[PDB]
Design a protein around this ligand. Structure first.
Ligand SMILES: Cc1cc2c(cc1C)N(C[C@H](O)[C@H](O)[C@H](O)COP(=O)(O)O)c1[nH]c(=O)[nH]c(=O)c1N2
Ligand SMILES: Cc1cc2c(cc1C)N(C[C@H](O)[C@H](O)[C@H](O)COP(=O)(O)O)c1[nH]c(=O)[nH]c(=O)c1N2
Ligand SMILES: Cc1cc2c(cc1C)N(C[C@H](O)[C@H](O)[C@H](O)COP(=O)(O)O)c1[nH]c(=O)[nH]c(=O)c1N2
Ligand SMILES: Cc1cc2c(cc1C)N(C[C@H](O)[C@H](O)[C@H](O)COP(=O)(O)O)c1[nH]c(=O)[nH]c(=O)c1N2
Ligand SMILES: Cc1cc2c(cc1C)N(C[C@H](O)[C@H](O)[C@H](O)COP(=O)(O)O)c1[nH]c(=O)[nH]c(=O)c1N2
Ligand SMILES: Cc1cc2c(cc1C)N(C[C@H](O)[C@H](O)[C@H](O)COP(=O)(O)O)c1[nH]c(=O)[nH]c(=O)c1N2
Ligand SMILES: Cc1cc2c(cc1C)N(C[C@H](O)[C@H](O)[C@H](O)COP(=O)(O)O)c1[nH]c(=O)[nH]c(=O)c1N2
Ligand SMILES: Cc1cc2c(cc1C)N(C[C@H](O)[C@H](O)[C@H](O)COP(=O)(O)O)c1[nH]c(=O)[nH]c(=O)c1N2
Ligand SMILES: CC(C)=CCOP(=O)(O)O
Ligand SMILES: CC(C)=CCOP(=O)(O)O
Ligand SMILES: CC(C)=CCOP(=O)(O)O
Ligand SMILES: CC(C)=CCOP(=O)(O)O
Ligand SMILES: CC(C)=CCOP(=O)(O)O
Ligand SMILES: CC(C)=CCOP(=O)(O)O
Ligand SMILES: CC(C)=CCOP(=O)(O)O
Ligand SMILES: CC(C)=CCOP(=O)(O)O
Ligand code: NA
Ligand code: NA
Ligand code: NA
Ligand code: NA
Ligand code: NA
Ligand code: NA
Ligand code: NA
Ligand code: NA
Lengths: 208, 208, 208, 208, 208, 208, 208, 208
């Protein structure tokens, strides 16, 4: 297969819970193993913004997401916010790509400064020190200089700063079309197949 | 009235032509004078992404946008890309707020480095030196370190970097709802009334 | 009225005494209260460059400038260079805008580094810490890297660096026309009405 | 195959047109797809420095280079300098490696600052934000501090700064031998096979 | 003779066309060879601000300036904005001093960042890399932090940042006296004789 | 196979000769080709800290290490400290990964500043310019700010700074267990199989 | 006595619990007063890596460590993670030296940025502002640029960054010998007597 | 004569020995005194890349180069790599210009950091502190960020970074033509006459 076998998908408390759920669904349909992390604020966002009734505790959350996505048993692992026995907490784990989608400005700050106050932040710290893929999907507006300095520091170190800023150049007709544009960019960045966003200009052989 | 009487609205060639058109429409309905600038690439974006048939030359473009928006005669001024006789080209003009919506990464770069190769770039140079409002609405993903350094430099100088990253926390039901979220943020930043985005928590008096 | 009720006008020992005297005259005619400070070197410049016979001591200087400008009694206050009992020396004073016109490279340096060796330098230190308007009008050529670093530091902090560099785009016919161009820019920056410099392009509705 | 299937080859107006033509020829013989971009100044350089009579417009240029290189139909695509419908203009395109050979100091500057004034500059902006290979082949002497700061910024971000500085350690006998040394370095950097430059010390098992 | 035999004089689109014309006239009267460059915006400034009817195309412009200045045949060369065959485009040319008078903020930016979009910008790039004299005469007010950072970068590299800020310490009686003050500073910087500005204090042997 | 076919293993004069010898042994058992470099100080460390009687000259050293490791003929190449004919001295060599284990603070400094005083330092210079893997294993305590700045500069450029700081989270029972922890991290970083350090949490499917 | 009478010993959640326990034991045997702090993650590390059954709550933990170390009554104080009434929380306390052993990357980050989220982080903030000794013993590999920047910032301010990187130059025969090497370095840094690590070269009077 | 009477020419171990030999020959034919320094690695390069049989020790090397170049007795001085009695080692010597051609990345590093490990490095240290001409001719590809930072630091201090990157704009027909292009640039930088590279555009009086 193309791209990573395992993806750590962390959802944090920015608006845009739909991006993370749709990414999760695509990862599952591409038969990838997903190590799923979600912050307490992201649980509140998901309740506010969607009709998904996500259970609170990891074992029930795992059963629920497995059913919601049509995943195979064991395909989605869920790890709690202080579970240092989970693979993402150590660089001696098997390699994963990591995506924080959406990424709050507070989680952006923790990753940029190296805070390790929960398993999402430790997992990102591990991705950076092991030079494993790390994609952050910030959703905020305006971006202040504090946000921008934190994004710049991480981008300089090879993290991919992929804002939740959908493009309109395929004439979107629904909210779902805009969500899929951003999710397709994430999948493209990871090297994972996707058929929601065509390859720009692939059939264009010479200028008019 | 609250907020600026005059707004220089520049559209450049990032995806998201719908944001600039909807902003223009709101500015007109709030009875503001709009100095409208559009780049050659933005004209191509508008043709690709919308069904608006915008005429090419300033005088016809002015007549068209006046009709499209229901504007009063003279409310929308259109200035061409080398018209140094227009108000935005000089700091001795009457004060305007300026918005570049959407803002391409190339126009972001020109503004951050002080290039003055067309009237949009000179207008932003003037806003910064006169300390008049300047709002940039970048639409790009990922943001590279070059983008981020350019945004950081301008934000440090007081420009507002407002990415086209809509929020979902009022349960959007259409593309138009997401466009209106971003446009409402711009209007809020300018100090101009808007009724598309409620005031978060205004009725919340104490925690549960 | 528009703009500040009170302006601290400091003259320091750069060439261009005529700019400060003409600014003083305009401020008086707009019925503003002026807290007037002048350095010992600026007194020598004024004697060299003009026919104004400015008395040396504050009380006589106050009487003289009141007559020279046609000011109301008490409209121009004059404070000596170590008078820490004057309003500009403390941030607990009533708010003023401040202009140093002209600004020597030596006073530019003191303001940029926070030296507080006389009341002009302390007044600027107070403007910066209170976030009250501060406009510097440097007159020097060439500008060395030391000058430029000092100007950059202050501009980054929100001071307005307005060099004594008049524009020619209204066909000046006299020295006085060039002096008035710079003074009009200062008044525009302060938000004070002026009729010497028209609003560029105000009557220009569309490009040719 | 080893290395990228598609290469965006941009020629800009530095001396050394022979490097870009020889690279193009090698890429074609390795059966790679080439998206060919050339600046207006580079067309003047190619006329000055070589006997290649390159047609001006993209469709004729494509036919000419196809014949000149012995390429298969469709193997060389040519895109004009404002053709935003071409794959290199968008990060949603299929992935290419990109080489700017030769790279003028002016194109180096545009890439380092994020200017996007033509399709070569936008293509490089896209390579950087997508973290796709970008190789710059500057040809200039001396290198000023402005050149060097621009090269350093891009190298820090992962672009390969490969100056047109041939090596002599295989006893070159012709201009073509020196051109081939630089082209072999570019091919090595891309991961594409080449037999012009041997693998240094491959047969050396222990020190004398 | 003292000072450079050849001067590249570039005029760009800042206010102050009179400074460049008066400099040109002085250079001619000192029997210097002048390589004259003028931007399209500077042509518009010259029409706005002066009664000089400068022809548009280089050959007619050369004939006109030769007559206007009383120059010898061949003393003033005029080169168009993309003429890479002119001496200033290459560091292998015979050495010139270069002055950009006046210097727009946009040309200041291009020189500071190394953009090479026309022959004025390439000529300055060449002056810096060859360590040949480069004098910039910016005319703008206020100077923003973007302007100031660009001036500081170039001054640190040895360019002379000489703002169009005339001095008043010889009691100017006309616009022409102020223009001559700035032109005399430029000539002094180049090492070229001038008799418009006396040598300050040359007859002062001891303090009073 | 997974990971690099060839590894340049340089040992320098920090304490921890056992790490480099154990790494060499693992590389040999994974059937990798090893280009072995050792500094004069590292030879003294190996004599002090181990019972390995390493011969001084490259040909005898090669024979000895081949026997000590059970390597195939030609699998371990040894190159002397000024042998510029060896593959690591040139970027035109076949690609290797490089590890400096252990890495003295003096070799760390040389690599960070680009000193090229022996073949280890040149080899690292080549790895960085070719963007080939470079892993440094510093052993020092305390780390001063000079050490830390040198490590930071190289890590920013993509070198892996992997201190000889073993972990205890698998209950080590011997010196050899701690040495193997660090060697396993190096092998993991290179992408080479190892069975000394389990994959953390690989069997952990959900939180307790 | 030599060295500090009181040491704040904080253990945080890096691997290497044995270093902190052995340091505690040495401090007790040198009759020092120890203010003992341990994070919740460090309690989990100690359970994983050792057979020490450390009670959870401070009063029981104090009784246990007193017995485990053979300490005098009151010699070991234990303070909980939000006990702002403990001496380390205020710079008006009696002076202590402080050691964080081991130091997680997350606690390193908090100290470098000034976060004060628990008593360990506040205690370090106090040590830095009072210029009292602060020693950090990080255990991590690789060190990322985020780790390295945080270590560099603190080392520049006078904190001692002492990685858990034991030396082998006295022929260690057990895990305990390597642990004692690091603990001896810490004691040496504090100025406290130790007999585990000899004074290098103390008997060496002249070179061979 | 024009340009320096004495030139310190140092050859170091980059590829491009032919540039240094051809420069030496030109300097001799312009009747300049040459203080010739060559590193041990450069001697190996010269043997690899040329048929020049350069003797090893300074006195024989001096006799050989005198014959090879047709120099006058005493015109070429040769100084060994630790000869601190030679003029280049002290700033109290008579002034020379200095050229390092070719310049290895290792010698570039030493000069940028101030290492003074041999007479070439001390000579460059002296040139910089005395503000005497220093020209470095690096030959390397790619240039890494370490190379680029070292070149930038020195260029900022006034050293001329002149890469061995020949131009093709006079239609070179041989290796020797390309070598002569670079040597002519060096001679131009020093102010020494040369007739290998014409003065670009010297006969071009106006644009077509
Ligand atoms: C409905 C809703 C929507 C948002 C938020 C909150 C809620 C409840 N918050 C604030 C964010 O959740 C808060 O700063 C948390 O501290 C983030 O914690 P984590 O980073 O998820 O641990 C938030 N934060 C942010 O950076 N971007 C956003 O778009 C939003 N939007
Ligand atoms: C349909 C379409 C869509 C986009 C673009 C182009 C086109 C045709 N371009 C590229 C952009 O237009 C190009 O870099 C221009 O050079 C921008 O010029 P202006 O800044 O508008 O003068 C573009 N650029 C960018 O920064 N963000 C974007 O989202 C897009 N999207
Ligand atoms: C007639 C005349 C003209 C000038 C000056 C002096 C005199 C006597 N000085 C020098 C300046 O006065 C001197 O550096 C003082 O130290 C400035 O002191 P204050 O900053 O006014 O206290 C001066 N300084 C400067 O920065 N720009 C200028 O244009 C001039 N011109
Ligand atoms: C024959 C010839 C040779 C050269 C050039 C020109 C010409 C006509 N130019 C100048 C360069 O073309 C100019 O600055 C253009 O503006 C570059 O534009 P592009 O970057 O190609 O769009 C040039 N520029 C540069 O950076 N390095 C070089 O070696 C040369 N050599
Ligand atoms: C009459 C008039 C006066 C001015 C200008 C314009 C016109 C028409 N412009 C704007 C300037 O010409 C514009 O930014 C151009 O893009 C500059 O292009 P060049 O740098 O000359 O290629 C201008 N720009 C500037 O930096 N300083 C100035 O004083 C002025 N004044
Ligand atoms: C037994 C023994 C142990 C050590 C050392 C030496 C010896 C003899 N040295 C010092 C180091 O060898 C010295 O600074 C050399 O200059 C390093 O040279 P290389 O970098 O190997 O060429 C040393 N240096 C260092 O950075 N870390 C260390 O742990 C040690 N330990
Ligand atoms: C067994 C074991 C081993 C380790 C860890 C955990 C566990 C359970 N953690 C992760 C660390 O505990 C986590 O990031 C905590 O957030 C650290 O919190 P404190 O800094 O102690 O509050 C960890 N962290 C680190 O920086 N270095 C390390 O060596 C280890 N090793
Ligand atoms: C044939 C040949 C060719 C080259 C080299 C070597 C040899 C033998 N070396 C490596 C260089 O000589 C080495 O790093 C020395 O340490 C340089 O020492 P000096 O700076 O001359 O003392 C080398 N180094 C470099 O920076 N650029 C180059 O082009 C080459 N080419
Ligand atoms: C949870 C755990 C074993 C963390 C240690 O991981 P690593 O050695 O710091 O990569
Ligand atoms: C178009 C024009 C008059 C530009 C000059 O404006 P400003 O004095 O630079 O603010
Ligand atoms: C002259 C005086 C009372 C200075 C103190 O003012 P502030 O409190 O420092 O703003
Ligand atoms: C030409 C085009 C569709 C540009 C937009 O690309 P991207 O989403 O900015 O990578
Ligand atoms: C127009 C031209 C020949 C440019 C090349 O000049 P240079 O070698 O870059 O100084
Ligand atoms: C030993 C040698 C041929 C060094 C030159 O290598 P490279 O071209 O600098 O990568
Ligand atoms: C817990 C406490 C009294 C903290 C205040 O201490 P300090 O004055 O900030 O050193
Ligand atoms: C070899 C020698 C006398 C070096 C001292 O020179 P300088 O005084 O440091 O310029
Ligand atoms: Na923490
Ligand atoms: Na411009
Ligand atoms: Na003082
Ligand atoms: Na642009
Ligand atoms: Na350009
Ligand atoms: Na060296
Ligand atoms: Na806190
Ligand atoms: Na030395």
């Amino acid at each position: 297969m193309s791209g990573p076998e395992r993806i750590t998908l962390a959802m944090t408390g920015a608006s845009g819970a739909q991006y993370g759920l749709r990414l999760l669904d695509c990862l599952v349909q591409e038969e990838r193993e997903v190590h799923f992390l979600i912050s307490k604020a992201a649980q509140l966002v998901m309740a506010t913004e969607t009709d998904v009734a996500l259970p609170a505790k990891p074992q029930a959350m795992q059963a629920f997401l497995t059913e919601y996505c049509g995943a195979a048993a064991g395909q989605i692992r869920v790890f709690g916010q202080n579970d240092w026995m989970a693979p993402p907490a150590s660089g001696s784990s098997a390699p994963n790509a990591m995506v924080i989608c959406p990424c709050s400005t507070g989680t952006l700050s923790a990753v940029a400064t190296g805070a390790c106050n929960n398993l999402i932040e430790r997992a990102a710290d591990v991705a950076l020190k092991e030079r494993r893929p790390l994609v952050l999907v910030p959703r905020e507006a305006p971006f202040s200089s504090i946000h921008l300095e934190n994004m710049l520091k991480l981008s300089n170190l090879g993290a991919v700063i992929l804002p939740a800023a959908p493009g309109f150049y395929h004439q979107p007709q629904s909210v779902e079309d805009l969500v899929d544009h951003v999710v397709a960019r994430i999948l493209n960045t990871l090297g994972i197949p996707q058929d929601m966003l065509p390859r720009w200009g692939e059939q264009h052989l010479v200028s008019d």
